[PDB]
Structure 1
Amino acid sequence: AAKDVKFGNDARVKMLRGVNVLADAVKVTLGPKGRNVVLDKSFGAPTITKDGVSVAREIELEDKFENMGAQMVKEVASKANDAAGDGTTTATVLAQAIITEGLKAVAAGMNPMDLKRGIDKAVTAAVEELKALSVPCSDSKAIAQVGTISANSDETVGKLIAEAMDKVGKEGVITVEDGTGLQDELDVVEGMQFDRGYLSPYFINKPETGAVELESPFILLADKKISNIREMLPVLEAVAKAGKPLLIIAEDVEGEALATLVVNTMRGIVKVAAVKAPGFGDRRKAMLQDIATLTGGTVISEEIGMELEKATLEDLGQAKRVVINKDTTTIIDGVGEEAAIQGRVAQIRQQIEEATSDYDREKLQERVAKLAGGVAVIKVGAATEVEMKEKKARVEDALHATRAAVEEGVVAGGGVALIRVASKLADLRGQNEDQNVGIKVALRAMEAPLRQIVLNCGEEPSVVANTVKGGDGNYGYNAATEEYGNMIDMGILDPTKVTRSALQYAASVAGLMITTECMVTDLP
């Protein structure tokens, strides 16, 4: 493939137009009073929406290069949300902010290496400021507090959320399932979770969630890398007539057997999905075992001779539910005998006796947790199935923020936090004057979100911003009501975590580009 290559500005300029489109298109939907975009559908009526994430999703430019600039931002702005539960848009918004000015600078004659530096500093600093302004969130009060708010006033919501963490703890594993009746339901059942995503997006069966919810399927607990499909035939057929889904866990899965299942499911007979096993080497050993224990499943170790073909349903584990995402698998209610489960615990416990290491003791400990800890579940009750599934949505939302609120507390959410921090370190200087500018850009860029909101609301940016600077603390302007005050008291905040994330990520990519000197791609 012969490539097309651009340098310096030629390159940067493309990148800039590329990004702008993305940002100019997704930004108009920021405020609570955001405007809407129309996403043309191939089949049927177009789609109107104010959800940046969706908008962003659809963006792809013809001009490669320009398109790269766009995809580059989207990538990290996504990562932002990935590791915070929101900000996706905001990040993008800042992204532009920085990139724009700083990119003019580089092009103006100033040194790029410094500009980046100056910025990073600004960010670094503001990030602290954020830590300062952040208001803790620890007691079940604060918890239900933030929850009910992020659930949009609905107190009942914030309630359960507090209850939940109040059961399995803050670090406890909580999940949601549509309610069976009109009442909400919080229950704790033998269950577990671990960081390990699916090996194929084509597994997702819940598009809007990018997740894979499975109904009381069987569970496979191998101990080798499954490349060839063969081994499965026995079991894969058992579950075929078993009329139930099936999940897999082992070293990994090569396309030979992998690529096959992917299609085998995407419009196929038996529809299943799998994910690598937690831990590596020696660790995985017990790890998987723990799971077997919990699901009442049999572990297939080749270090025992037993092969896959040499296995029947009697060897599979079971749980009533199980969901996986881009990078995490979590089971619910495993059929493992309490006697068995509880016993295993005893085992581990003892093992922690060795205490021969704080890493080994910490380790064993962690397993103890997963296994004996359990998994809290909720069932969004509701009158109509609409409200039902709708509310359910709002719930999963809140929970996010809440976890986040817990982790890093929260702050003013109208773009306020940023304005604040910026006005703060307004002297902050750098060595090279090219670094000062670097810092300005950075700071001035933080005004972005707020100004944009106001803008989208049809209000005076410069004016609102100004008066917001004036006050202090979490004193801000509620775009939604056009009233200033304590954004937090007014129920307008952002999990400290996300705001940072957003801002860091945007900074990241920005400099990244500001330091880019070449771009390669295919020819039109």
Structure 2
Amino acid sequence: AAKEVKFHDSARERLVAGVNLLANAVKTTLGPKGRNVVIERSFGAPIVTKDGVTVAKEIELKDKFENMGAQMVKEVASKTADVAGDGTTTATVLAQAIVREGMKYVAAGMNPMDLKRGIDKAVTAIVEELKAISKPCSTTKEIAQVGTISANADSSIGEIIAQAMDKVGKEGVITVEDGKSLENELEVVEGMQFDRGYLSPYFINNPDKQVAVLDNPYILLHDKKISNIRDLLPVLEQVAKAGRPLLIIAEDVEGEALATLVVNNLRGILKTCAVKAPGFGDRRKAMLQDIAILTGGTVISEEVGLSLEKATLEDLGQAKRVEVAKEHTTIIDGAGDPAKIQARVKEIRVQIEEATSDYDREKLQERVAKLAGGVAVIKVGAATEVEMKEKKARVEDALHATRAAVEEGIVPGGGVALLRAREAAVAKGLKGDNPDQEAGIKIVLRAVEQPLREIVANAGEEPSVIVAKVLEGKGNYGYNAATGEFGDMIEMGVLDPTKVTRSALQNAASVAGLMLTTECMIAEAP
């Protein structure tokens, strides 16, 4: 169709309008005293929320050229969120601040590329300083404290998180399942997680968690491509007559087969989910074999003398539960006997010494870890189903925060962390090779205080005086919007994982650079 093209300021200002309109809605839900945002529902009463994730997801504008910036900032915010579990509100606010300051200098005739380079230099310096301000958290007591703080002073959640992490590994897999009692419980079951997601968003069945969950399904293993629906019809018919859900692991599924699976999932004909097999090259067969032996199934392949047209339910693997997310899929309580699993673990461990390179050895070690480590399952316990729903979400959020916290430590939250990092970086000595790079540095130095300013503004106080008072303090000293007091932010349990702040700042800087160095904009004509 016909396109409409906008150049220079006439397009940068539309980007700015879009990002400003997205951020003005998102930032009202930032801080302990964040305001409410009312969102229309198609039917029934409007939904009111005070979290940035839901408000941002619903925001998309009428004008296409503003929607461009809105969606790019939303995408970078979601990229920040999915890897840290929080900060998408912070990332959008930081991006708005950086862009709003950057357009002032761009309109001043200053070089956009040098502005981008100065912004990158300042962000690199601030991130490098965050690695020093951050307090590490590796002791079980520290892990429990961080979990309790993230779970709103619920000590049981923190204790359960610590007990799951300290025996399965800080890099281990932890999942949450509804418990059978009032007290939370945990267990280790045979399972693994691999970095493969569902191939279509229609596969999801839990919009609240944005994941696909199947209960006691069959596992289909294939090492070749699947495009023809006929190639798996006799197997899916057996699965449907069996009545249990289906998880299909293949090299790829596309075309009429994928379309038919999507239609079946939408119509409720059969509960199906298809993901790409993990790894590539020769690692593909090893991954498929390990998954099959873990789920008790057999890989369907010509080299092993089986065909999908004749495959039966006996060849298929099975497990208690499989969770399919956007980036990774995990298997819970595979049907494989522990004896064969341990034998294969020993086989892989002795093949480790057969590695021809450090890359081979590290992949074999990853295989050993993903196979022998199992999956930690947290049985969240509470009195009622209504309390079940809330406690499960709280435990999941605490688990994500602890996973982020244990990797990079904790840092004074509420936006004080960025101020401390900025002051430390400036004291270290930060300069640009050009006056344009100097303005780029100034842009980030002014923008990194925006999260605290907006938290204070939503709290109702005057931003400038609070920011000045926070800057006059040193260390963990900061402002607590929940109570309005000044003191050690860590001591009151107001924390953010260093990963969250670092990722928010870096993604905001990236999107700000992209929409500062943008000179042309192409969109569909009205």
- Report the counterpart of residue 145 of structure 1 in structure 2: 145
The equivalent residue for 2:518 is 516
1:271 CA displacement: 1.6
Q: Report the alpha carbon displacement of residue 382 of structure 1 after superposing the two structures with TM.
A: 0.4
**How many angstroms apart in 2 are the aligned matches of 1:202 and 1:135?**
41
Q: Aligned with 2:102: secondary structure?
A: helix
Task: Give, in whole Å, the separation in 2 of the partners of 1:339 and 1:84.
Answer: 37
1:384 and 2:384 are equivalent in the alignment: yes
Measured against aligned partners, the alpha-carbon deviations of 1:275-323 in whole angstroms (never above 9, x if no partner) come to: 1111101111111101111111011012234210111000010110110
| Contact 2:156 2:184 (C-alpha < 8 Å) held by counterparts | no
| Letter paired with 1:438 | G
Distance of 1:308 and 1:68 partners within structure 2: 44
* CA apart distance, 1:503: 0.4
**5 Å matches for 1:81-480?**
81-426=81-426, 428-480=430-482
RMSD: 1.1
Amino acid at match of 2:183: Q
Contact residue 422 and residue 444 of structure 1 kept, 8 A: no
For 2:96 and 2:480, locate their aligned partners in 1 and report how far apart those are by CA, in whole Å. Answer: 24
Contact 2:64/2:523 (CA < 8 Å) preserved in 1?
yes
Contact 2:175 2:378 in 1 (8 A): yes
- The CA deviation at 1:270 is 0.9
Question: What SS class does the counterpart of residue 208 from structure 1 fall into?
Answer: coil
CA shift at 1:232, angstroms?
1.3
- In structure 1, what residue type is equivalent to 2:515? M
Deviation of residue 425 (structure 1)?
3.3
What is the CA-CA distance between 1:429 and the residue it aligns to? 2.3
C-alpha distance in 1, partners of 2:2/2:251? 38
Partner residue, 1:505: 507
- Secondary structure class of the residue paired with 1:257: helix
Work out whether 1:2 is the aligned partner of 2:29.
Answer: no
| Partner Cα distance (2:151, 2:43) in 1 | 33
CA–CA distance in structure 2, aligned partners of residues 14 and 349 of structure 1: 57
Distance 1:168 1:108 in 2: 56
Give the whole-Å Cα distance in 2 for the aligned partners of 1:273 and 1:114: 47
1:433 offset after TM fit, Å?
Answer: 1.1
Counterpart of 1:510, as a letter, is A
One-letter amino acid of the counterpart of residue 126, structure 1: I
What amino acid is the match of 2:462?
E
Runs ≥4 in structure 1, deviation > 6 angstroms? none
Residue 315 of structure 1: SS of its match in structure 2? coil
Structure 1, 293-302 or 427-436: larger mean CA deviation: 427-436
2: distance between equivalents of 1:2 and 1:523? 5
- In 1, Cα distance between the equivalents of 2:271 and 2:393? 25
Other structure's SS at 1:28 match = helix
What is the percent sequence identity of the aligned residues? 77
Contact 2:164 2:376 in 1 (8 A): yes
**2:454–2:463 Cα contact (<8 Å) kept:** yes
Deviation at 1:339, TM superposition (A): 2.2
Q: Give the residue type in structure 2 aligned to 1:373.
A: G
3-state SS in 2 of match to 1:289:
helix
Within 1, Cα distance between the matches of 2:74 and 2:363? Answer: 36
Letter matched to residue 391 of structure 1: K
| Separation of aligned partners in 2, 1:363 and 1:435 | 42
Q: For each residue in 1:58-86, what CA deviation from the matched residue of structure 2 results, as whole angstroms up to 9, or x when unmatched?
A: 11111111110111100101100111111
Q: Which runs of 5+ in 2 are unaligned?
A: none
Counterparts of 1:166 and 1:424, CA distance in 2: 34
In the TM superposition, residue 467 of structure 1 has moved relative to its aligned partner by 0.5
Looking at structure 2, the residues matched to 90 and 436 of structure 1 have their Cα atoms a distance apart, in angstroms, of: 24
Equivalent pair of 2:214/2:271 in contact (CA under 8 Å):
no
- Taking the aligned partners of 1:120 and 1:249, their CA distance within structure 2 comes to 41
Q: Which amino acid letter does the alignment assign opposite residue 509 of structure 1?
A: V
Aligned residue number for residue 80 of structure 1: 80
**Partner Cα separation in structure 2 for residue 345 and residue 91 of structure 1:** 42
SS class of match (1:214): strand
Partner secondary structure for residue 465 of structure 1? helix
Q: Determine the structure 2 residue equivalent to 1:32.
A: 32
Q: How many angstroms apart in 1 are the aligned matches of 2:113 and 2:350?
A: 56
Counting matched residue pairs gives: 524
**Structure 1 length normalisation: TM-score?**
0.98
- 1:6 alignment partner, SS class: strand
CA deviation vs aligned residue, 1:313-350 (integer Å, no higher than 9, x gap)? 00010110110111100000011112221222222222
- After superposition, residues 51-62 of structure 1 pair within 5 angstroms as 51-62=51-62
Shift of 1:191: 0.8
Bigger Cα displacement from structure 2, 477-486 vs 304-313:
304-313
Equivalent residue letter for 2:131: K
Q: Alpha-carbon deviations, 1:362-417, whole Å to 9, x = none?
A: 22221122112211101110001111121111101011111111110010111110
1:9-35 deviation per Cα after TM superposition (whole angstroms, max 9, x unaligned): 001011101110000111111011011
Q: Which amino acid aligns with 2:444?
A: A
1:377 alignment partner, SS class: strand
Q: Take 1:343 and 1:172, find their aligned partners in 2: how far apart are those partners?
A: 21
Cα pair 1:27 1:93 within 8 Å, conserved? yes
Kindly provide the amino acid, as one letter, of the partner of residue 104 in structure 2.
K
The range that moved more, 61-70 or 424-433, is: 424-433
SS, match of residue 163 in structure 1: helix
User: Which stretch has the larger CA shift, 459-468 or 383-392?
Assistant: 383-392
Asked if structure 1 preserves the Cα contact closer than 8 Å seen for 2:292 and 2:298, the reply is: yes
Corresponding residue SS for 2:256: coil
Structure 2 CA distance for aligned equivalents of residues 417 and 365 of structure 1: 36
Structure 1 residue 457: Cα displacement: 0.8
CA distance in 2, matches of 1:351, 1:179: 39
Q: Return the alpha-carbon distance in structure 2 between the equivalents of residues 137 and 363 of structure 1.
A: 27
